Design a binder for this molecule. Structure first.
Ligand SMILES: [Mg+2]
Ligand SMILES: [Zn+2]
Lengths: 13, 1340, 237, 251, 148
DNA sequence: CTCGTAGAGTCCGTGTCA
């Protein structure tokens, strides 16, 4: 994973 | 000679003939906007481009089309003056014709039904005035041009810093007009990595795989082949003699039983030549030579059918044996070398992790959008949209041209999206540069930098708006119904209007106009800029972009640039420079034939100019254009040197084409150091117009062009004779040659009286001609601010002396006489505007009543019955301009006032006094008052009177114009009615009206008379309509901001005199501050008793090499001597003959010049007029690099009976004793910069304080304190001044109780303080406690 | 460039020469504009580091110091002893080249008179107290600091000297931006220091030390130049 | 605070607190509503992100102000930075009893004197003039003294000349490279608007008369005046603090 | 949250597709949330509806007439007394941030709650004078005056 | 001589000033 901090990406995943 | 030129002729030094004349100075702006509107048939630059780019709009196969047809521009609601006064923008409505086509489902496509909706309104586009400015919100603005890097492909080096081991790391880049950036770069290991615009690094082979490419295809593309075969043994390798160059022989290179080369010796030139001559193609080598190769194409066993050998792996003995036993006889190996063909793509493939197209696409998608799952369709769509989507990507026409020429192609036309071929070419070129073939390109070259103007920017904003509207329309039509909707509700002008307004109103390139001088405006309009959107930044510029590239010669001025943080990022335009059709700057050069310098001009850009050899401007020629001296100095490729006479290709067109207008207005520029020339060029813009500006005695000849090209002066459109002149109007009776068949008409010019500029200066035009005087086309009829007879005049020329005077000119300071102030030489008029707004408050509305509380008749003497100051009243600081009262209540007085009112019984009023008053220290005269009242409110008496005056003035103006035009048309009617039967008696006797009434018995003239009567009635009706429109416009309502009921604006005229502390400067970068005003009888005087106006220090010249001022002083002295001679000759009225002879002798007075003056002038009228104009001094002209010389100045001094040395004996006014060491006296042209001391002095003791941090409100509009920084704290700590510092940062600024106690103590006469604690510390404690931290004050 | 500007400002400069000079003009302007900010930052850091140093004592009664000698590079002198030792206070009594006599007593502010007396004789090296070797903790003492001041006397007690030092160092910041043989420039004796050499058959001394220096002692015992002789050098005398 | 014309201005901390409170309330409602796990987890993540933005902004997503692209100002951004409280309000505050003007030559002065315009002196010394007027019986109440000063009567000028006798002032030039950029002089009232500076102190100040400006401060307390007269006077600073060489040489 | 409410309040007997019902509830919830918690100074939902209708009508007038809609014309076109329109126009702003560049907007905000030092000095002088005058008077009369 | 640490090379990146 890219270790992104965006909650949007986590919720979409 | 033109009349304006023949009134006063400027004696002109200068030997170089002129072939090309200065062009229109404001051409770039006008051309850009014209191209922007430019209704043209072909789809190109303009609004047509955007309309054809967006439309037609197609639905999701919905069988409906919305197709563009045409467009037009309406007429502005308000003109420039109305917009300026009201406070709105000056623009025109955009009306576009749209046609909607709908198809039925489903059958062959056809015109089911088309609704031709007409004139859909789409926002407004601001218009450009006649001079190149915009009126956005009642304020003039200028849209400066931008210098930005052009689209294309550029190769850099990044030499040096990388790894601190040399080994420069090359790279490339592709920059589109609109889209993402591609990039390639090398690394310390020599691996080609590719980066998306700014994302993470990646091997270069991922992209190649993503383009549907395989390892074999890549190897074939980026490498060559080597042939191997086994002629039954010993690897009879197929050799090429050419490839053997640059290597050491490893075996016995022999053929045909002959050993051309033997093992143990490296290949040499002779060996290669012998192999070429002997035609040896095949040799024999052991397996050792082939053990180190790399196989291109995979190899598999035919018998077994297994992938024994794949592509791109290092070979081995076992692999060779396997391939040989498997029947393989030919093997291909990449031709690799350590000098010419490095193994870069092979290494990238080895390190590349991906193997197939899908893996590469997944990798790209993950890199671009990390953290989300990848999919085949999503990755494919992303890759297609990134670089190969015409909607999200477009390079340019110019971008495509640059990209093609960089790759050495013969076609400069292509598509707006990349392709596999372009990427392959870029990669190949980068690899070739890495291998040692080719050269990188420098960024600062002006062949790589492009210039943008207003039209392009406005078109881009319009395109953005259209794109948004088109997307919205697509969505609405797809989702919404398509059976009855008319195409007037699916398109909204809101987005286009928003985009255009955002660009024009709130942008870094739309700048508040500079209006100090005509010169300031001219230089503002011709300005380049590297900042702004899409450009660099002040703090991230560097030392290599703020530098004078050699390509600037003839295109950008090298000595005019700001001296602050943004130095080298402005680069005012040159004099002869233009803009290419692609946006590149070009300059003119004279075409040179075999040996004859022709007179045909060719415009060349940097790329073209680099090749040819260009001669110099100051190259002697002899009446056939033959270079007199054989070795002519030229410059060919970024360098200069001597060249043969019959080897030059071009020649400079003029000696002025290296500088701008501002730097071309400086005489004797070649004698001034560069720094001081830059300072003078920057300062000459800031001069403020004086009460009467006369002229420069020593000029250069660029004054007339600057004065005329600027729109301050009034210039005759057609020739004629002046029919009526006044301080507010000029009427010209056009010649019989220039009048059209009908509408004989007359020219009327309305002058601009005292108005205000952006900088609060005065703008005033005054007549320049007299009654019954001829005028020709292009003449000047009215002077603007700071011009005289059509010439520019920014300052005034004074009598100066260079000597020290008792330390009153110690530093750059100056000593001025009293006769300079008595004669009002440097007096200026400034106009201010003040406003008083009546708002609505919760308690109640405000009032503009004239009955103010607790104020006597003294303050209300100048207020009329309505409560507004009179016109013409002379007010002083602290006076009341407009009265006003605000409601109030519940004062809540403390017991003491209760007792006081009980004893005295004085009532407490409920209305506060909030009237408008003149600022302290300023006194002037009221010259204009305006009143704006919100719609739906009663108008007071003053407003009604003002509007009645306005209506009467408008009617009078229209009537006067109609009567002038009616006199003209009566002359026309006399001319016409003379024909068709000539009746001299009837015309004189018959009244003008009766002329049209009469008609012939029967002829076409009867119909013509009927038509004339009908047209006269129509003209009467249309004039009535104009009057009604004017009246309705004057009487309509006002659209004001919410909460305002009335607005009153007052204009005060202030006259500023000269005083110590004011700043004066010359044209050679010599500044100073006036130090004293000396009496007339204390100034030094010469033998004749005439004092000296100003005294300057001699110590400023030697340390600052600006020798131009001394030459200017000498030449001014000579000119004034000639003028004095003429004046003395004229006072005793000798005769016309003596004046003619002397003036002719003065005009000749040269060494091979090109003046060529009379005798051809009028007998005595013209000569006497010229003498009267010259009696104050003969003007001189000195071009920049072709001016006067010392010998000519000495001759001019000798003719005027002056000491050729330039120095005279002076005496001391206070003693009568004569100074030793004769002094240098002359005339110099001095300016008055707008650094007035009345705008600088400031002081406070107490006042308002901030809200969050209770500190004084620093500034100037409010009192504000002087900031006490940390450097001053260190300075006070260096001493032992603890108490001063403590009071400085405790009681003076921030501690409230300390402030009050200190004030009371000072009043009471006790100088003591109680420090306390500042408020900022408490604020900091609370803020830090708002976090999780816990900070407290201990005690022990 | 390979060709210079052969004209001056009394005469005229043609287009090419003036265009050439513009380069240096603009470069100098930019360089000054940036050096100002660099100097400002450096002075801020300097003030930050040592802003709490004050003279909190009168005399720590120490005996150490720094041995002050004139700095002579090659055959030239760049800094005399008078400027180096003027204002300091001696740590140990200074003895003249003729021993058994105390030219100056122990710690005493060396003002102009003492400097003139020293220069009268052939004093070459004098030891003076320095603030780097002060015994006072949480500050420095007046004797170990010295005299230098806008005043001419010794330093007072309670003075903030760190800020003064930082400001003094930072103020002039904006103004900043073969040989096989050695030949003497003055007559005198030749002194060898830290030298180990052997004479060859031909009659020369073989430099057998990697840290050999060549001195110059005059008739007054004052060195006039300093040269370093690398290992393996031919000796003349 | 409300602005003139019905407009309002507020701090970003207000909107940050509003966001935090709203998300906390929504999370509480969801918990009380027995929502699925995913919704509760997302609400918790949103609350944590809001708290992090409120405390220290620009670490995760740099939330920008509504209707604008500028990022919000976090609590940590107020304390720190070159424009924070520590460096902008705790060491560089504005002060009262001060002014500035353009400097001139004034070659007739003495080494301890300067030239101060009458208007600047009057407006700087107002309170002293009020006190003197009340003391001398010319004005019964402070309002009468204020009116007299505003009318600019001759007695006012005499009182000012009496109150400015031996009161030194401090003159400062913009770049204070060393402690010689501030010195104390004895004002001499003149007519005009430019400050006259002794020629010998220009080198120490690094000042030239081509548009330079200078500021003047008035020491109030008695110890402040004594310090100005005994430590900062122009006749007390003749040698360079960097080296004992004089700094008042003729230029 | 709205979809949870809809699923809780769903009946499959009618046979309609759940999409429309869920969309109805979700849209209602989203609109209510935007109305309630979208502004620093919250305003009632009916005011939001009035503002939206006014904006739509103004857009229609601007498109049809070309030049611009004036408040009076938007008055007669609507069916209100032309003053509520002005109030709704005035009540349609949002607070500004104090860090807007110009220096910053927050540096020009004056404190209007402070009392001038001259006022304090005047009050002190008045207090002293009143005390002196009261002391001048008699005992009982002065005491009564103070008490009153 | 294999394989474990553990130095030590690397190095890529987050950070902090101007
Ligand atoms: Mg200056
Ligand atoms: Zn010590």
């Amino acid at each position: 994973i890219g270790r992104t901090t965006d909650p949007v990406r986590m919720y979409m995943r | 000679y033109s009349y304006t030129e023949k009134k006063r002729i400027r004696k002109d030094f200068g030997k170089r003939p002129q072939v090309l004349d200065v062009p229109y100075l404001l051409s770039i702006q006008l051309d850009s906007f014209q191209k922007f509107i430019e209704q043209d048939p072909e789809g190109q630059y303009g609004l047509e481009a955007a309309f054809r780019s967006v439309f037609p709009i197609q639905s999701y196969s919905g069988n409906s089309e919305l197709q563009y047809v045409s467009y037009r521009l309406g007429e502005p609601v308000f003109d420039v003056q109305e917009c300026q006064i009201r406070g709105v923008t000056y623009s025109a409505p955009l009306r576009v014709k749209l046609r909607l086509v709908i198809y039925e489902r489903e059958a062959p496509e056809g015109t089911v039904k088309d609704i031709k909706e007409q004139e859909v309104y789409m926002g407004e586009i601001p218009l450009m005035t006649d001079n190149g400015t915009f009126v956005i919100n009642g304020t003039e603005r200028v849209i400066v041009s931008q210098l930005h890097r052009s689209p294309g492909v550029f190769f850099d080096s990044d030499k040096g810093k990388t790894h601190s081991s040399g080994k420069v790391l090359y790279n490339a880049r592709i920059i589109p007009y609109r889209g993402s950036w591609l990039d390639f770069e090398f690394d310390p290991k020599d691996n080609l990595f590719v980066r998306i615009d700014r994302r993470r690094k990646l091997p270069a082979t991922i992209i190649l795989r993503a383009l549907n490419y395989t390892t074999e295809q890549i190897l074939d593309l980026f490498f060559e082949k080597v042939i191997f075969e086994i002629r039954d043994n010993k690897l009879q390798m197929e050799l090429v003699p050419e490839r053997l160059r640059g290597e050491t022989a490893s075996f016995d290179i022999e053929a045909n039983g002959k050993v051309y080369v033997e093992k143990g010796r490296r290949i040499t030139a002779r060996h290669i030549r012998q192999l070429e001559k002997d035609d040896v193609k095949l040799i024999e080598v052991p397996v050792e030579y082939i053990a180190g190769k790399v196989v291109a194409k995979d190899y598999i066993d035919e018998s077994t059918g297994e992938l024994i050998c794949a592509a791109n792996m290092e070979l081995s003995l076992d692999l060779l044996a396997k391939l040989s036993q498997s029947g393989h006889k030919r093997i291909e190996t990449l031709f690799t070398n350590d000098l010419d063909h490095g193994p870069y793509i092979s290494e990238t493939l080895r390190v590349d992790p991906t193997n197939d197209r899908l893996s590469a696409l997944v990798e790209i998608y993950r890199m671009m959008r990390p953290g989300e799952p990848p999919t085949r369709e999503a990755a494919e769509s992303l890759f297609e949209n990134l670089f190969f989507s015409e909607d999200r990507y477009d390079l340019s026409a110019v971008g495509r041209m640059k990209f093609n020429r960089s790759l050495l192609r013969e076609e400069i036309e292509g598509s707006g999206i990349l392709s596999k071929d372009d990427i392959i070419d870029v990669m190949k070129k980068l690899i070739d540069i890495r291998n040692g073939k080719g050269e990188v390109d420098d960024i600062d070259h002006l062949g790589n930098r492009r210039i943008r103007s207003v039209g392009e920017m406005a078109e881009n904003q319009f395109r953005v708006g259209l794109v948004r509207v088109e997307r919205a329309v697509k969505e609405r039509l797809s989702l919404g119904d398509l059976d009855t909707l008319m195409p007037q509700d699916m398109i909204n002008a809101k987005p286009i209007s928003a985009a255009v307004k955002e660009f024009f109103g709130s942008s870094q390139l739309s700048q508040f106009m500079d209006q100090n001088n005509p010169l300031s405006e001219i230089t503002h309009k011709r300005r380049i800029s590297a900042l702004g959107p899409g450009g660099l930044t002040r703090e991230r510029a560097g030392f290599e972009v703020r530098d004078v590239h050699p390509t600037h010669y003839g295109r950008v001025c090298p000595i005019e640039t700001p001296e602050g943080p943004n130095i080298g990022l402005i680069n005012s335009l040159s004099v002869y420079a233009q803009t290419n059709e692609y946006g590149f700057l070009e300059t003119p050069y004279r075409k040179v034939t075999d040996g004859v310098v022709t007179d045909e001009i060719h415009y060349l850009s940097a790329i073209e100019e680099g090749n040819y050899v260009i001669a110099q401007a100051n190259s002697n020629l002899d009446e056939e254009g033959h270079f007199v001296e054989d070795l002519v100095t030229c410059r060919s490729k970024g360098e200069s040197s001597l060249f043969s006479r019959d080897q030059v290709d071009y020649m400079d067109v003029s000696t002025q084409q290296v500088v701008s207008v501002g730097a071309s207005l400086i005489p004797f520029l070649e004698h001034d150091d560069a720094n001081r020339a830059l300072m003078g060029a920057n300062m000459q813009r800031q001069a403020v117009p004086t009460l009467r500006a006369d002229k420069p005695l020593v000029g250069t000849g660029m004054e007339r062009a600057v004065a005329v090209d600027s729109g301050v002066t009034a210039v005759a459109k057609r020739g004629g004779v002046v029919q009526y002149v006044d301080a507010s109007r000029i009427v010209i009776k056009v010649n019989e040659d220039e009048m059209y068949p009908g509408e004989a008409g007359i020219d009327i010019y309305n002058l601009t009286k005292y108005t205000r500029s952006n900088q609060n200066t005065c703008i005033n035009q005054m007549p320049c001609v007299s009654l019954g005087e001829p005028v020709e086309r292009g003449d000047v009829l009215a002077d603007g601010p700071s011009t005289d007879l059509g010439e520019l005049a920014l300052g005034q020329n004074m009598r100066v002396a260079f000597m020290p005077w008792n330390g009153y000119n110690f530093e750059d300071s100056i000593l001025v006489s009293e006769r300079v102030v008595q004669e009002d030489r440097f007096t200026t008029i400034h106009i201010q505007e003040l406003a008083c707004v009546s708002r609505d408050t919760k308690l109640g509305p405000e009032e503009i009543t004239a009955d103010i509380p607790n104020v006597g008749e003294a303050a209300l003497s100048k207020l009329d019955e309505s409560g507004i100051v009179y016109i013409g009243a002379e007010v002083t600081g602290g006076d009341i301009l407009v009265g006003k009262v605000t409601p109030k209540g519940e004062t809540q007085l403390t017991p003491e006032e209760k007792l006081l009112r009980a004893i005295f019984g004085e009532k407490a009023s409920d209305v506060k006094d909030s009237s408008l008053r003149v600022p302290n220290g300023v006194s002037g005269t009221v010259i204009d008052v305006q009143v704006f009242t919100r719609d739906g409110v009663e108008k007071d008496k003053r407003a009604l009177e003002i509007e009645e005056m306005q209506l009467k003035q408008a009617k009078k103006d229209l009537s006067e114009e109609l009567q002038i035009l009616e006199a003209g048309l009566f002359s026309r009617i006399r001319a016409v009615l003379v024909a068709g039967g000539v009746e001299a008696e009837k015309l004189d006797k018959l009244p003008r009206d009766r002329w049209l009434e009469l008609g012939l018995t029967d002829e076409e003239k009867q119909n013509q008379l009927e038509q004339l009567a009908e047209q006269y009635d129509e003209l009467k009706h249309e004039f009535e309509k104009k009057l009604e429109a004017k009246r309705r416009k004057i009487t309509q309502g006002d659209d004001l901001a919410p909460g305002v009921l009335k607005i009153v604006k007052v204009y005060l005229a202030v006259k500023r005199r000269i005083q110590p502390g004011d700043k004066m400067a010359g044209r050679h970068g010599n500044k100073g501050v006036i130090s004293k005003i000396n009496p007339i009888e204390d100034m030094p005087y010469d033998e004749n008793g005439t004092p000296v106006d100003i005294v300057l220090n001699p110590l400023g010249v030697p340390s600052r090499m600006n020798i131009g001022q001394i030459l200017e002083t000498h030449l001014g002295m000579a000119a004034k001597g000639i003028g004095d001679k003429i004046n003395a000759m004229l006072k005793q009225q000798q005769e016309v003959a003596k004046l003619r002879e002397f003036i002719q002798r003065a005009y000749d007075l040269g060494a091979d010049v090109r003046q060529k003056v009379d005798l051809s002038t009028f007998s005595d009228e013209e000569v006497m007029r010229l003498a009267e104009n010259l009696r104050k001094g003969m003007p001189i002209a000195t071009p920049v690099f072709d001016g006067a010389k010392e010998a000519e100045i000495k001759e001019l001094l000798k003719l005027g009976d002056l000491p050729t040395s330039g120095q005279i004996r002076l005496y001391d006014g206070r003693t009568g004793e004569q100074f030793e060491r004769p002094v240098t006296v002359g005339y110099m042209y001095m300016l008055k910069l707008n650094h007035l001391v009345d705008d600088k002095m400031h002081a406070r003791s107490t006042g308002s304080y901030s809200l969050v941090t209770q500190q004084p409100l620093g500034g100037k509009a409010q009192f504000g304190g002087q900031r006490f920084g940390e450097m001053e704290v260190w300075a006070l700590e260096a001493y032992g001044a603890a108490y001063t510092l403590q009071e400085m940062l405790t009681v003076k600024s921030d501690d409230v109780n300390g402030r009050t106690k200190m004030y009371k103590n000072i009043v009471d006469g006790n100088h003591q303080m109680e420090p306390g604690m500042p408020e900022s510390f408490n604020v900091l404690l609370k803020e830090i406690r708002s976090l999780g931290i816990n900070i407290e004050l201990e005690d022990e | 460039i390979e060709t210079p500007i052969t004209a001056n400002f009394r005469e005229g400069l043609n287009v090419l020469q003036y265009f050439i000079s513009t380069h240096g003009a603009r470069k100098g302007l930019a360089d000054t504009a940036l050096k100002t900010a660099n100097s400002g930052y450096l002075t801020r850091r300097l003030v930050d580091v040592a802003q709490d140093l004050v003279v909190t004592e009168d005399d720590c009664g120490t005996h150490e110091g720094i041995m002050m000698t004139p700095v002579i590079e090659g055959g030239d002198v760049k800094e005399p002893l008078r400027d180096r030792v003027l204002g300091r206070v001696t740590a140990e009594d200074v003895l003249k080249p003729g021993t058994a006599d105390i030219l100056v007593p122990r710690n005493t502010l060396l003002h102009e008179q003492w400097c003139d007396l020293l220069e009268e004789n052939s004093v070459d090296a004098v030891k003076v107290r320095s603030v780097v070797s002060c015994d006072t903790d949480f500050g420095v003492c007046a004797h170990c600091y010295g005299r230098d001041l806008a005043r001419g006397h010794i330093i007072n007690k309670g003075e903030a000297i760190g800020v003064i030092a930082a400001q003094s160092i930072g103020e002039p910041g904006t103004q900043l931006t073969a040989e096989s043989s050695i030949q003497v420039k003055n007559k005198g004796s030749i002194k060898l220091s830290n030298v180990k050499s052997v004479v060859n058959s031909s009659g020369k001394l073989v430099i057998t030390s990697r840290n050999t220096e060549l001195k110059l002692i005059d008739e007054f015992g004052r060195t006039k130049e300093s040269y370093k002789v690398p290992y393996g050098a031919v000796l003349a005398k | 605070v409300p602005l003139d014309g019905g407009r309002f201005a507020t701090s970003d901390l207000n909107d940050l607190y509003r966001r935090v409170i709203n998300r906390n309330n929504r999370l509480k409602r969801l918990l009380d509503l027995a929502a699925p796990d995913i919704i509760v987890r997302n609400e918790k993540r949103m609350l944590q992100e809001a708290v992090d933005a409120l405390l220290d902004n620009g670490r995760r997503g740099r939330a920008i102000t509504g209707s604008n692209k500028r990022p919000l100002k976090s609590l940590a951004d107020m304390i720190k930075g070159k424009q924070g409280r520590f460096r902008q309000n705790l060491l560089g505050k504005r002060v009262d009893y001060s002014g500035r003007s353009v400097i001139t030559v004034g070659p007739y002065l003495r080494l301890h004197q300067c030239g101060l315009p009458k208007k600047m002196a009057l407006e700087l010394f107002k309170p002293f003039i009020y006190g003197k007027l009340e003391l001398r019986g010319l004005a019964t109440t402070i309002k009468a003294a204020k009116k007299m000063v505003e009318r600019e009567e001759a007695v006012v000028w005499d009182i000012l000349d009496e109150v400015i006798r031996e009161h030194p002032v401090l003159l400062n030039r913009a770049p204070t490279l060393h402690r010689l950029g501030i010195q104390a002089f004895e004002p001499v009232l003149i007519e005009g608007k430019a400050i006259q500076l002794h020629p010998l102190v220009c080198a120490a100040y690094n000042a030239d008369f081509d548009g330079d400006q200078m500021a003047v401060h008035v020491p109030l307390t008695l110890e402040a005046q004594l310090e100005a007269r005994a430590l900062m006077m122009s006749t007390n600073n003749i040698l360079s603090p960097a080296n004992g060489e004089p700094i008042i040489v003729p230029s | 949250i709205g979809l949870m409410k809809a699923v809780d309040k769903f009946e499959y007997r009618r046979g309609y597709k759940f999409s429309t019902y869920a969309t109805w509830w979700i849209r209602q919830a989203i609109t209510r949330s935007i109305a309630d918690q979208a502004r620093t100074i919250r305003i009632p939902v009916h005011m939001i509806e009035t503002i939206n209708k006014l904006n739509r009508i103004s857009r229609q007038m601007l498109q049809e007439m070309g030049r611009e809609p004036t408040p009076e014309e938007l008055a007669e076109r609507m069916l209100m007394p032309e003053d509520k329109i002005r109030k709704v126009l005035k009540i349609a702003k949002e607070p500004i941030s104090m860090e807007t560049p110009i220096s910053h907007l927050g540096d020009f905000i004056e404190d209007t709650t402070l009392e001038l030092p001259l006022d304090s000095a005047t009050t002190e002088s008045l207090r002293a004078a009143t005390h002196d005058v009261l002391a001048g008077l008699t005992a009982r009369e002065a005491k009564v005056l103070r008490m009153r």
